[PDB]
């Protein structure tokens, strides 16, 4: 995001984004895919609480654990606090989730997790 000789060097994700603080265009060369930047900004919206260290930010991005309020979660955990089986968010049964990509697309709601 600085050092204009580094502007001769195409931005990387793990470089300018996590460790530095990549701009959206830096993040863009740093991911190419539009969906990659979508998930990137969803995380960074949820991961300002874990900006540093790089381990905090990476664990908040991956989502296989809980960071902050944990809406960034992306792991395999399908077991609640009291142990009742998780309902698949696509199936409206038992409880119909009005919460999906239409309402909050950032959380990237998974299969059953």
């Amino acid at each position: 995001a600085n050092t204009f000789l580094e502007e001769v060097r195409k931005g990387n994700l793990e470089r300018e984004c996590v460790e530095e603080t990549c701009s959206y265009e830096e993040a863009f060369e740093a991911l190419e895919s539009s969906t990659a930047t979508d998930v990137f900004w969803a995380k960074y919206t949820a991961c300002e609480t874990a900006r540093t260290p790089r381990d905090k930010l990476a664990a908040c991005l991956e989502g296989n654990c809980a960071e902050g309020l944990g809406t960034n979660y992306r792991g395999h955990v399908n077991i609640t606090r009291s142990g009742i089986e998780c309902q698949l968010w696509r199936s409206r049964y038992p409880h119909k989730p009005e919460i999906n990509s239409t309402t909050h697309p950032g959380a990237d709601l998974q299969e059953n997790f």
């Binding site: 204009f4 502007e7 001769v8 265009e25």
Partner: protein, 50 residues
């Protein structure tokens, strides 16, 4: 016999390719029948120019 030197003008060495620091951009055309507004036109132009 030290008269000094004539250096009223600067001498600048330029990069080799003319320019180096540059961003990217995207084609744009006016949006008809709105008095303003714009829209993407990638029909015949690269979506990423220098």
């Amino acid at each position: 016999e030290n008269h000094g030197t004539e250096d009223e003008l600067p001498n600048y060495c330029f990069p080799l390719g003319g320019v180096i620091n540059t961003e990217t951009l995207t084609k744009v055309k006016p949006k008809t029948g709105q008095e303003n507004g714009w829209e993407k036109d990638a029909t015949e132009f690269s979506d990423k120019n220098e």
